[PDB]
Design a protein around this nucleic acid. Sequence first.
DNA 1: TATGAATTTCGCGACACAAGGCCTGGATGTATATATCTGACACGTGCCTGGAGACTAGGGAGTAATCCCCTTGGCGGTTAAAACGCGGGGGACA
Length: 88
Amino acid sequence: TTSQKHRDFVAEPMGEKPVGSLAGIGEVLGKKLEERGFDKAYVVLGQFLVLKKDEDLFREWLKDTCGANAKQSRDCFGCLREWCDAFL
DNA sequence: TATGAATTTCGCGACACAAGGCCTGGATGTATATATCTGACACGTGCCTGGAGACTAGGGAGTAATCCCCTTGGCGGTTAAAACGCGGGGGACA
């Protein structure tokens, strides 16, 4: 259902977690995202909120911004959406 | 395109690490022991007045006869008090 990384990210507010803290976002993808400018997880979330929490927008943008497959982009969107439901 | 490859991300074991629960001992105040002195504790003496002994009085006190009386003892009934059940709501309790 959910990755343990996803559950850990969901359980608490993100605060200042790096983009690598996102579920399905490891060293390589998180590093690529930081190179693209979204150096922080909350920057990526602001992008996600600007996309009006859209799954397709966020996942396709993530895929074209770091190279994540459907799995990693889907996990990242799910993590962001569930965190938004929990705290936002 | 179906297959492999790549890639990656989540799940897994060894390692070292630190924090908490008994074991132990020593510093800690308390009870034990002991030398010093000093005026009270006790001892002992002279005495005289209270204690001890004899004689008397008589009135207090023990004891028997009597009354009555009142205190013990029993019955009926009529209760009004006492006994028992209940609901509570307010007081004692934490």
